[PDB]
Amino acid sequence: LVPLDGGRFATSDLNDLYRRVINRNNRLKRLLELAAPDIIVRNEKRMLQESVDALLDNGRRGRAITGSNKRPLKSLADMIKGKQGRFRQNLLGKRVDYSGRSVITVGPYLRLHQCGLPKKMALELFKPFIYSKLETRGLATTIKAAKKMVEREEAVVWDILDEVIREHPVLLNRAPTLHRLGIQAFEPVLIEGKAIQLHPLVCAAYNADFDGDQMAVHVPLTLEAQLEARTLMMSTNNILSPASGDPIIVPSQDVVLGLYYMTREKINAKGEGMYLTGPAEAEKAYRTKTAELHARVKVRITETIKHENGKLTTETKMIDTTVGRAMLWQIVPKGLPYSLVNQKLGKKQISNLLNEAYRKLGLKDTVIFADQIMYTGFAYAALSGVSVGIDDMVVPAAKYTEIAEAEEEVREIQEQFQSGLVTAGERYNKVIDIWASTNDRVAKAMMENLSSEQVINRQGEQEKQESFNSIYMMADSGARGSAAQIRQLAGMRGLMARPDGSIIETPITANFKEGLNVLQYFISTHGARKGLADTALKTANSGYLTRRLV
């Protein structure tokens, strides 16, 4: 029962319940003293039972007693139980000290064991450590002086902070924490600004993307906690998924696009057919604007095989490859075949590179290789100049003819329903198949048009080449995108479902490049709203299931 502000008081409902019980017990004693009639004594005993029941467990014996706010009172049981009870809100999940929270950005210069911590958060979280060091080196005589220097933001406080942080791991967390990779230990690098810089390769573990997500920062204090963070919780030790064993640090997006563009083959490029002494020579050739990055060359590759028994066999042969694969061979550690690089590298190929590096080399080589893959992919995705434009969505010329033929055949089945040859359900299931085959044929035509091109070789002949379209490269590299999204981009959006689950007979024959009219957009919203609502309910149900399983 405490004074909030300016004479206003805040109490607990237990006070009201206990007051009722005491008042009615006193009334019962007074009635017994006065030798009251039996009916009044009986009613008093009845209310005593009711009040004690409301105190122990309100809303169970009868109607819940409500306070002056027209809300039910909270009893002992109601606060030892429930989601907002003692157990789940204060004994299993606790608010903690030495904690912070900030928006997360991307640090492409960081390493796996490093995270970018703002100096303000580091100063506020590591304050007792700063005080300790200031006293032990004698810059501050007592704790008050140390606080004065820390608050004044003196110069030496920053050196003290960079000595405390030097080898002190910090735990980064993101809500929700679906699995154990949602909390990881990093070595802090102190940065200006107010945002935490996160290594890209760990984002997939956090399910974190930089559109405004925030992360929590925890500072372990005791030596045992620091050893646990450095030995068990380090991001370097956490590179395999505990669910399946597959690597979780596989590159995505920009890295995959860069490594894919670097490992592609172009026909009749500048510097084709040259002979190169090795990866360094290929790098020299591309930096000198002699051979294009997609030029076919013959490169002398030295290659070490590490057998299962530990045999390290070195060999050197001349391999037909491109300049880009020759360069990428520089960062591949010894003990791996060149056949792992001598191909266009999508997401699956890079995942296989990391998997085999872990299998035949261990963890340190794997983490160094993952870092180098990330830097090379970022650099060459930057140098590539991949850009999405409006001429990149090549709508096939067969789409209009197919739509016209589908309309003609739908009208033919429309003048055949009156003949009684078919039923309404048969007409429905036939128009649906007509349009659901027109969709497949339009998608196939678009993919055939978009994934091929015709180039001129050195001889002068016309030769088919895999296309270098931006959207096609995005989809084929596996970076971000798929065939269905391209078919909704440049083909046909397709048949859609009514809010009940039924399928509208007339599909959306227009794509996003040429735009939709009002009805098509309404039909699209019909499914968008379902998707969002089902995502929300799915999150709730999955959380409940995970809690029961744990």
Partner: peptide, 10 residues
């Protein structure tokens, strides 16, 4: 039949 002390007292 009823669980309200007020009605019982009535």
């Amino acid at each position: 039949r009823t669980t309200d002390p007020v009605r019982m007292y009535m």
